[PDB]
Design a binder for this molecule. Structure first.
Ligand SMILES: Nc1nc2c(ncn2[C@@H]2O[C@H](COP(=O)(O)OP(=O)(O)O)[C@@H](O)[C@H]2O)c(=O)[nH]1
Length: 369
């Protein structure tokens, strides 16, 4: 099973290039796409070595980078231009798809803030049209801006079978707090770190989580609640890691309870103390769960890249994320009363209102019906 990734817009292209840099460094692959001498399953993201990427001005910057051997501002303009070159890009996508043995998904890295937003909208629609059996995960990055953002949310709440949010505000906050920057090229480091650590269990095989469905179907219980948040504590026992992870100081997010939690530990820790960690976490009652269905926290281990200490990442399904949408929603209303049919934006507002209502109803003991 092979995962193909797509990079749209300046932000998406930059974060994808840095992610590929990080991943090539994790393995023994020189910038010249030649394996270095110096166990790690690398077939998923690399083709025998060339990455499975589809880039769509900064391309010249990448071509001038040492890694050359490795390959307007409106939403409506982006959508129109994406409709204009449907066949041109889809020939590339189809040749790269059918060239693969068994395709699995379509990772999409883009910022919902110019042309990237509408282009990703169009691509998501067309991929939902053509390929009906391919999971679509999206590493979308959150910031006339409210218009584009809400349109992207409208297209993402029904097409993408999963989604991971990344807000530049929280990243900048963490940068000023514990990195003391005052830049794109600095927050992108942490972004690429989180991304590389996200797909750790796919490249280093373990007891469980050998496929994307193993990561998705565990967290997302219903097809609507498919927005996740990330946490990365190392910026030592597993209990300390789990206690530092659940702190709101580290989560990349600007009653309420949890739906599903997943922990990935990349250290050489003793794997016998994890059950004690979970026992004590349940004892002290540091986190709450849904009252209707039985929801638990899952933990998995892995191995750090030997060619490159204890780290850890956390993927959560928290109902608080809806708050962010509200802000956008709010701004849209503020933008709707200040200034062919202009009805698509109204439908977008309607469906995002539906989604926020569903999130707000999810935290009730009678969420069913
Ligand atoms: N987190 C992050 N966001 C970025 C970076 N570069 C650009 N962005 C976002 O991308 C948006 C600009 O997109 P733009 O390049 O104009 O899209 P285009 O019109 O299709 O080229 C801004 O609102 C930024 O928030 C980056 O390095 N990191």
């Amino acid at each position: 099973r092979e995962i193909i990734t797509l990079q749209l817009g300046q932000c998406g292209n930059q974060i994808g290039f840095e992610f590929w840099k990080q991943l090539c460094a994790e393995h023994g692959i020189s910038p010249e796409a030649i394996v270095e001498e110096f166990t790690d399953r690398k077939d998923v993201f690399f083709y025998q070595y060339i990455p499975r990427a589809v880039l769509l001005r900064v391309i010249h910057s990448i071509l001038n980078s040492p890694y050359a051997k490795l390959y307007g501002n409106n939403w409506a303009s982006g959508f129109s231009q994406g409709e204009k070159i449907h066949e041109d890009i889809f020939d590339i996508i189809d040749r790269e798809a059918d060239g693969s043995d068994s395709l699995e998904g379509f990772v999409l890295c883009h910022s919902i803030a110019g042309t990237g937003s509408g282009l990703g909208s169009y691509l998501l629609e067309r991929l939902n049209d053509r390929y009906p059996k391919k999971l679509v995960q999206t590493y979308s990055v959150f910031p006339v801006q409210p218009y584009n953002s809400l349109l992207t949310l409208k297209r993402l709440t029904q097409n993408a079978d999963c989604l991971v949010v990344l807000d530049n505000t929280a990243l900048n906050r963490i940068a000023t707090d514990r990195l003391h920057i005052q830049s794109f090229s600095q927050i992108n480091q942490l972004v690429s770190t989180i991304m590389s650590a996200s797909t750790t269990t796919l490249r280093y095989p373990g007891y469980m989580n050998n496929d994307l469905i193993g990561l998705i179907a565990s967290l997302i219980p219903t097809p609507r609640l498919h927005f996740l948040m990330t946490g990365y504590t190392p910026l030592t026992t597993v209990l300390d890691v789990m206690r530092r992870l659940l702190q709101p100081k580290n989560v990349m997010v600007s009653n309420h309870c949890y739906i599903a939690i997943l922990n990935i530990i990349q250290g050489e820790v003793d794997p016998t103390q994890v059950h004690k960690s979970l026992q004590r976490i349940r004892e002290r009652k540091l986190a709450n769960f849904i009252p209707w269905g039985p929801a638990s926290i899952q933990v998995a281990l892995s191995r750090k890249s030997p060619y490159l200490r204890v780290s850890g990442l956390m993927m959560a399904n928290h109902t608080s994320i809806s708050s962010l949408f509200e802000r956008t929603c709010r701004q849209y209303d503020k933008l709707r009363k200040r200034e062919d049919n202009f009805d698509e934006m109204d439908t977008s507002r309607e469906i995002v209102q539906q989604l926020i209502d569903e999130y707000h109803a999810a935290t009730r003991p009678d969420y069913i019906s």
